[PDB]
Design a protein around this ligand. Structure first.
Ligand code: SF4
Ligand SMILES: [Mg+2]
Ligand SMILES: [Mg+2]
Ligand SMILES: [Mg+2]
Ligand SMILES: [Mg+2]
Ligand SMILES: [Mg+2]
Ligand SMILES: [Mg+2]
Ligand SMILES: [Mg+2]
Ligand SMILES: [Mg+2]
Ligand SMILES: [Mg+2]
Ligand SMILES: [Mg+2]
Ligand SMILES: [Mg+2]
Ligand SMILES: [Mg+2]
Ligand SMILES: [Mg+2]
Ligand SMILES: [Mg+2]
Ligand SMILES: [Mg+2]
Ligand SMILES: [Mg+2]
Ligand SMILES: [Mg+2]
Ligand SMILES: [Mg+2]
Ligand SMILES: [Mg+2]
Ligand SMILES: [Mg+2]
Ligand SMILES: [Mg+2]
Ligand SMILES: [Mg+2]
Ligand SMILES: [Mg+2]
Ligand SMILES: [Mg+2]
Ligand SMILES: [Mg+2]
Ligand SMILES: [Mg+2]
Ligand SMILES: [Mg+2]
Ligand SMILES: [Mg+2]
Ligand SMILES: [Mg+2]
Ligand SMILES: [Mg+2]
Ligand SMILES: [Mg+2]
Ligand SMILES: [Mg+2]
Ligand SMILES: [Mg+2]
Ligand SMILES: [Mg+2]
Ligand SMILES: [Mg+2]
Ligand SMILES: [Mg+2]
Ligand SMILES: [Mg+2]
Ligand SMILES: [Mg+2]
Ligand SMILES: [Mg+2]
Ligand SMILES: [Mg+2]
Ligand SMILES: [Mg+2]
Ligand SMILES: [Mg+2]
Ligand SMILES: [Mg+2]
Ligand SMILES: [Mg+2]
Ligand SMILES: [Mg+2]
Ligand SMILES: [Mg+2]
Ligand SMILES: [Mg+2]
Ligand SMILES: [Mg+2]
Ligand SMILES: [Mg+2]
Ligand SMILES: [Mg+2]
Ligand SMILES: [Mg+2]
Ligand SMILES: [Mg+2]
Ligand SMILES: [Mg+2]
Ligand SMILES: [Mg+2]
Ligand SMILES: [Mg+2]
Ligand SMILES: [Mg+2]
Ligand SMILES: [Mg+2]
Ligand SMILES: [Mg+2]
Ligand SMILES: [Mg+2]
Ligand SMILES: [Mg+2]
Ligand SMILES: [Mg+2]
Ligand SMILES: [Mg+2]
Ligand SMILES: [Mg+2]
Ligand SMILES: [Mg+2]
Ligand SMILES: [Mg+2]
Ligand SMILES: [Mg+2]
Ligand SMILES: [Mg+2]
Ligand SMILES: [Mg+2]
Ligand SMILES: [Mg+2]
Ligand SMILES: [Mg+2]
Ligand SMILES: [Mg+2]
Ligand SMILES: [Mg+2]
Ligand SMILES: [Mg+2]
Ligand SMILES: [Mg+2]
Ligand SMILES: [Mg+2]
Ligand SMILES: [Mg+2]
Ligand SMILES: [Mg+2]
Ligand SMILES: [Mg+2]
Ligand SMILES: [Mg+2]
Ligand SMILES: [Mg+2]
Ligand SMILES: [Mg+2]
Ligand SMILES: [Mg+2]
Ligand SMILES: [Mg+2]
Ligand SMILES: [Mg+2]
Ligand SMILES: [Mg+2]
Ligand SMILES: [Mg+2]
Ligand SMILES: [Mg+2]
Ligand SMILES: [Mg+2]
Ligand SMILES: [Mg+2]
Ligand SMILES: [Mg+2]
Lengths: 137, 99, 208, 82, 96, 122
RNA sequence: GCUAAUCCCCCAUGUGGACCCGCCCCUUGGGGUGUGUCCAAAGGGCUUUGCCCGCUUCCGGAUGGGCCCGCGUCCCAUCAGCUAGUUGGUGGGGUAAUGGCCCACCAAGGCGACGACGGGUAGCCGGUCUGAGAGGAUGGCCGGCCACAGGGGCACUGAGACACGGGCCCCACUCCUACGGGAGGCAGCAGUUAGGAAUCUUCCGCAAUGGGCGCAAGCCUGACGGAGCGACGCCGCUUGGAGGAAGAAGCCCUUCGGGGUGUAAACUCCUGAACCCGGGACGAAACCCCCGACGAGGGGACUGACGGUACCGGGGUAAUAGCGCCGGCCAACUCCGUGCCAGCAGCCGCGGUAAUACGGAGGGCGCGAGCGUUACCCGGAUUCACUGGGCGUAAAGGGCGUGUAGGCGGCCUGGGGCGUCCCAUGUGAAAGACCACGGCUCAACCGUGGGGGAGCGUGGGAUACGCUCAGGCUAGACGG
RNA sequence: CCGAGGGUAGGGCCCGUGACUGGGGCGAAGUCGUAACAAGGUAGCUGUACCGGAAGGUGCGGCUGGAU
């Protein structure tokens, strides 16, 4: 496994697309800090540290919209979109002045900075930059 | 200031001179990724005290010879032959890239 | 220079009276009153559906034909508007308006912009005192647009000054007849002019 | 020596010099060492002359030599008032 | 077809004479003195060495030697003479 | 390709192949005609196209089109040429400029006259 | 053969400065000090026991430079190996100065897939052009650096040159001549010729800015300031304006009733480019002279190539329009002629007797002292794709393993802080560009002010992710 | 001594050109046949090999991208 982070985000996207209530990803005090952004910003209900076969995991509680009318009754997603930016193949770093506005504000860019994991909004607030972990909307 | 660089000694087969290999990273100007590039400096060692495997710092200095414009500033670590291997194995591999 | 030919065919092609003459524009001897179909052998033939391209060309040509201005000059203004702050469609109409010869025709000193040119060109006009005979002078707020003293006493300008006495003049202008002088109050809000131009279609012409 | 003089900018029949400190061996309109004011011989605006006077005294203090018709525009701005 | 650049060449030729002339002597003497100091012959070496040192600094007054050349020439003279005398010694006059 | 692959090999800016080499970077080039004659065009056309083989100041010898109805070109006719092939006569890649050197304009053109070096009439 | 000097030399004089040795600070050859040694000079002019311009040695400044280092700088790997002054060392030579820059000896090294060596192409930058941007393309004019001065080599003079209009030599070419001999170097401004698709007057002036010499008067200045030619470009302006028929003639169409050109013309009136007449600049106030003190300061005078031009006044004539296109893309349609011919053509395609596609015509569309064509650059081209593409069948998975370099890499904890991120500060010239204002009647053009940036140096700071060191783990992997 | 260059001798790369020659592209108004496309009238294609005026054929092995 070469990208624990992408692996997580993908475990989610994959789950969210068949409408699972939850899905578990292998635990990391960094992966957590990202989920701590994902829930706070209201993309997930939240997470809890559980265990599977003795091994530390993060069970992640997924969130969607109403049932819908039409021949396809499947609800809208709350996480419509989530994708790595920086990767191990190509680390992506931004100064504060060049942090992107995801989707006109309606989405976020989580970022690892030396003031911890922030959103665009949060980063610009404390006025620091860093590795741009990913984007969600 | 006088530019200072840190690197491994890869040759001591000269008298009063060592070859110090300095490495650096930098984002690719277009493709973003952090990439390494390295370069050998001939460093003045009047004392023949620096040896193969030494990780050292060298300081840009007034020219000593053609090609020698750095003196060894000071030792940093001893015995990194594992680096010297990296370099040497690459040179040795060159015998296979010919015709 | 400017167009200088049969001017009625213009209106006829545009399908709209543009008031390019002055007096005759208002009579029933107006071309568009007699033959409101396009000039030449084919105007009576049934029009076929104009292309999108067609449409925007026409709108631009019309706005341009009104001011009798050369296409280069038109263009240079429009660009000027695209660098200038705000809404380009506005500013463009505004900047088209702040031209001397238009202001002069706006303030009524002549019956046609065509006539209002030859007036500026023949040095019969002034701004803030000084004589100006450049039809393209970009007039700013505050500017006093007079008749030449030596030109005040002239038949044509008399007859044309007399026709202005109680005619009201755009919210962005003031006219002091007898005193033969007028004032550029501000740049025109779009509403302040009501030209048969969807100037939006113009921006769209130049974005191809 | 280092000199203080007029570099002609502007355009044809429309002079606009920059009183300027440059090396004597430069070309007229060349790289100057420092700009220190301007001069409009046609006098066509409220301030057709200006001089950083605190500066022009430094360059002088340290050996710059003004041209003739620069000396004047430095007198007229009273860099010489004792 | 004419100039005062001609004049300027005329003079160069003449300065050249005085220069070459001056530099010859300086070398002649330093060598003479280094030669003595090898087989030293202490007093005599030092005698000539002064005569060089004079001649060096004298050329340095003008365009012949740049003063640092003179410095450089002088330094290398003294270094040579002395260290030669150390295989035998001892310094008979001045100096120093 | 991976990002790495691109660090290693880069992307390749691809050059253009000029379609009028004989010009040698010139907008036009002078020449003399060797052969002046007619050529049959390819499917589905049919004609007797007028053509000159021209020897150039640029060392090259090419076939150039002679546009217009009728001309005055023969061997030794000095001619200016311009770029532009004639699609239906393969190998013809250049045009003779009428109205220049020994190539007359078209007698009696009224329309499109500049492209044919025919003067404004009475 | 003669004679002068700010020419040359000798001695004197030593604040100082140079050099060897010692010693103190400093730490590459920086500053100080003691002994020894060595080094200065030119006087000219006034109003003449006093000032001006010089001359000398030292120190600092300022400005201009030399050298050195990090990083950046195109195409071909069908160029993969290159290197004997080669890489290092010791001593010397040389220079302002380090250095294999040069030399002697010694050692056997230096470089290379992070692309050496080789070939090809190109002066580099500020910028310019395009592009939403990223990027691409480009380096003409202006500014900066470099390099060169018929092709080569060389040094001399000098603060500075290995010197475009200085010197030496060799070559190639041309010329002159009295036939013995000798001379040249426009890639300075003009100009000739050749080449070419193609690129200017053998103009005027030092009035202005600048430079050189001079105490100054001033002299020189093809730098420069201007004038000439050329729609080459951009910007500005003209060939008029108002009125004027249910609407002439001519010409085109026509179902022969009419439709078009067209308010277009005529004609009527108004203005008044050009032209004529008068006046007529800004650019020029310093230098100098006067008083004062040859300073500060006040006042006097000279001087304008452009140019009697711009411009101001008065008078005053209706006064150049051309080019492309009209099958679709693409805005603009009918008649005749032609009949797979003549021809058009950027792509698709038009023409074989009713062609909106050829040629002419009427009419129409687009621009207008321009319009078109050819060439080339970016664009459209997300068609080299970083932004921002792809590989079952469209072009595209290596025949398969094994493995070197490389690229990449699980969970937890600490140290370091390289990447990364923040702040401060220096640098980021000027012009250009962007925003504001202002001057030429506008504009173009031009001036003043403002706004920043990447990037790189320096100081400080942060530690999440990447890194690195250190210590744990067992989910990857390996083993029993 | 070094030294522009000159001379001698032998190498390397590149460009132009050459009797003749090999195929290639095109043209098309021709001769010969009909190899592929249908089970294309012998399923096709294929690497190799031998062979034949020519498309091609046959052997060996492979693929189905083969009709029934
Ligand atoms: S409006 Fe005036 S211009 Fe337009 S047609 Fe009627 S008359 Fe002619
Ligand atoms: Mg990305
Ligand atoms: Mg050395
Ligand atoms: Mg109106
Ligand atoms: Mg529309
Ligand atoms: Mg705008
Ligand atoms: Mg209106
Ligand atoms: Mg556009
Ligand atoms: Mg002289
Ligand atoms: Mg001798
Ligand atoms: Mg010298
Ligand atoms: Mg000296
Ligand atoms: Mg055909
Ligand atoms: Mg020829
Ligand atoms: Mg045509
Ligand atoms: Mg005497
Ligand atoms: Mg003495
Ligand atoms: Mg040797
Ligand atoms: Mg040495
Ligand atoms: Mg020197
Ligand atoms: Mg060497
Ligand atoms: Mg490298
Ligand atoms: Mg390569
Ligand atoms: Mg070459
Ligand atoms: Mg070149
Ligand atoms: Mg684009
Ligand atoms: Mg270039
Ligand atoms: Mg160019
Ligand atoms: Mg330049
Ligand atoms: Mg040379
Ligand atoms: Mg030369
Ligand atoms: Mg030449
Ligand atoms: Mg020469
Ligand atoms: Mg010279
Ligand atoms: Mg020379
Ligand atoms: Mg040189
Ligand atoms: Mg020079
Ligand atoms: Mg010359
Ligand atoms: Mg004789
Ligand atoms: Mg001779
Ligand atoms: Mg001559
Ligand atoms: Mg010329
Ligand atoms: Mg010619
Ligand atoms: Mg010129
Ligand atoms: Mg002068
Ligand atoms: Mg002067
Ligand atoms: Mg002087
Ligand atoms: Mg002259
Ligand atoms: Mg009628
Ligand atoms: Mg009618
Ligand atoms: Mg009629
Ligand atoms: Mg009319
Ligand atoms: Mg004046
Ligand atoms: Mg067109
Ligand atoms: Mg178009
Ligand atoms: Mg159409
Ligand atoms: Mg015919
Ligand atoms: Mg017909
Ligand atoms: Mg067509
Ligand atoms: Mg036609
Ligand atoms: Mg124009
Ligand atoms: Mg293109
Ligand atoms: Mg487009
Ligand atoms: Mg692109
Ligand atoms: Mg991509
Ligand atoms: Mg594709
Ligand atoms: Mg496979
Ligand atoms: Mg293989
Ligand atoms: Mg590995
Ligand atoms: Mg790693
Ligand atoms: Mg890790
Ligand atoms: Mg760090
Ligand atoms: Mg900065
Ligand atoms: Mg700037
Ligand atoms: Mg900006
Ligand atoms: Mg203004
Ligand atoms: Mg500015
Ligand atoms: Mg840590
Ligand atoms: Mg570990
Ligand atoms: Mg396991
Ligand atoms: Mg030799
Ligand atoms: Mg040789
Ligand atoms: Mg020779
Ligand atoms: Mg052949
Ligand atoms: Mg078969
Ligand atoms: Mg068959
Ligand atoms: Mg078959
Ligand atoms: Mg077979
Ligand atoms: Mg046979
Ligand atoms: Mg057989
Ligand atoms: Mg098989």
């Amino acid at each position: 496994l070469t990208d624990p982070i992408a692996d997580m985000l993908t475990r989610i996207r994959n789950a969210t697309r068949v409408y699972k209530e939850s899905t578990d990803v292998p635990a990391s005090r960094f992966k957590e800090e990202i989920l701590r952004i994902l829930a706070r910003e209201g993309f997930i209900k939240g997470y809890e540290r559980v265990d599977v076969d003795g091994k530390p995991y993060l069970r992640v509680y997924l969130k969607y919209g109403p049932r819908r009318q039409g021949p396809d009754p499947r609800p809208e997603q709350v996480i419509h979109h989530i994708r790595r930016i920086s990767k191990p193949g190509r680390r992506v770093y931004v100064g504060v002045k060049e942090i992107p506005r995801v989707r006109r504000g309606l989405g976020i860019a989580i970022l690892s900075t030396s003031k911890g994991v922030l959103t665009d909004r949060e980063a610009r607030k404390l006025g620091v930059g860093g590795e741009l972990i990913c984007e969600v909307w | 200031p006088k530019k200072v660089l840190t690197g491994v000694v890869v040759s001591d087969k000269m008298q009063k001179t060592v070859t110090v290999l300095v490495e650096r990273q930098f984002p690719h100007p277009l493709y973003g990724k952090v990439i390494k590039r390295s370069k050998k400096y001939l460093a003045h060692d009047p004392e023949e005290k620096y040896k193969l495997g030494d990780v050292v710092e060298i300081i840009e200095s007034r020219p000593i010879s053609k090609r020698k414009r750095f003196r060894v500033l000071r030792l940093v670590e001893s015995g990194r032959m594992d680096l010297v291997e990296k370099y040497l194995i690459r040179r040795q591999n060159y015998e296979s890239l010919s015709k | 220079g400017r167009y200088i030919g049969p001017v009625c065919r213009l209106c006829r092609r545009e399908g709209v009276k543009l008031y390019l003459k002055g007096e005759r524009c208002y009579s029933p001897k107006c071309a568009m009153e007699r033959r409101p179909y396009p000039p030449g052998q084919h105007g009576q033939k049934r029009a076929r559906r104009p292309s999108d391209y067609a449409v925007r060309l026409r709108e631009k040509q019309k706005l341009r034909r009104i001011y009798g201005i050369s296409e280069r000059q038109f263009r240079n203004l429009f660009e000027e508007a695209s660098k200038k702050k705000g809404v380009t469609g506005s500013v463009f109409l505004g900047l088209l308006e702040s031209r001397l010869d238009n202001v002069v025709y706006r303030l009524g000193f002549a019956v046609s912009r065509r006539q209002a040119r030859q007036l500026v060109r023949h040095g019969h006009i002034t701004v803030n005192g000084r004589r100006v005979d450049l039809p393209s002078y970009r007039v700013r707020p505050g500017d006093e647009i007079a008749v030449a003293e030596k030109s005040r006493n002239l038949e044509l300008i008399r007859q044309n000054l007399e026709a202005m006495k109680g005619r009201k003049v755009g919210p962005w202008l003031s006219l002091d007849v007898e005193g033969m002088k007028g004032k550029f109050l501000r740049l025109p809000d779009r509403e302040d002019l009501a030209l048969p131009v969807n100037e939006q279609l113009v921006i769209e012409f130049y974005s191809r | 020596m280092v000199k203080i003089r007029l570099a002609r900018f502007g355009s044809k029949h429309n002079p606009h010099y920059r009183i300027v400190v440059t090396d004597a061996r430069r070309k007229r309109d060349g790289k100057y060492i420092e700009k220190i004011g301007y001069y409009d011989p046609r006098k066509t605006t409220p301030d057709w002359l200006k001089v950083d006077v605190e500066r022009a005294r430094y360059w002088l203090s340290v050996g710059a030599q003004p041209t003739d018709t620069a000396r004047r525009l430095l007198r007229q701005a009273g860099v010489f008032r004792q | 077809r004419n100039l005062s650049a001609l004049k300027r060449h005329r003079q160069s030729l003449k300065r050249r004479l005085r220069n070459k002339a001056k530099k010859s002597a300086i070398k002649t003497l330093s060598k003479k003195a280094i030669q003595l100091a090898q087989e030293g012959k202490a007093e005599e070496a030092l005698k000539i060495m002064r005569k060089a040192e004079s001649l060096i600094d004298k050329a340095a007054k003008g365009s012949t030697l740049h003063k640092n050349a003179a410095a450089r020439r002088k330094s290398r003279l003294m270094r040579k003479v002395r260290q030669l005398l150390e295989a035998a010694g001892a310094p008979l006059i001045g100096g120093g | 390709p991976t990002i790495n692959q691109l660090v290693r090999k880069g992307r390749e800016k691809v050059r253009k192949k000029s379609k009028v080499p004989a010009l040698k970077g010139a907008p036009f080039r002078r020449g003399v005609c060797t052969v002046v004659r007619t050529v049959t065009p390819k499917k589905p056309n049919s004609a007797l196209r007028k053509v000159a083989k021209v020897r150039l100041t640029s060392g090259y010898e090419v076939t150039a089109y002679i546009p217009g109805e009728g001309h005055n070109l023969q061997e030794h006719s000095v001619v200016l040429i311009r770029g532009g092939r004639v699609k239906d006569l393969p190998g013809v890649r250049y045009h003779i400029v009428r109205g220049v050197y020994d190539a007359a304009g078209v007698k009696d053109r009224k329309k499109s006259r500049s492209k044919y070096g025919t003067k404004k009439p009475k």
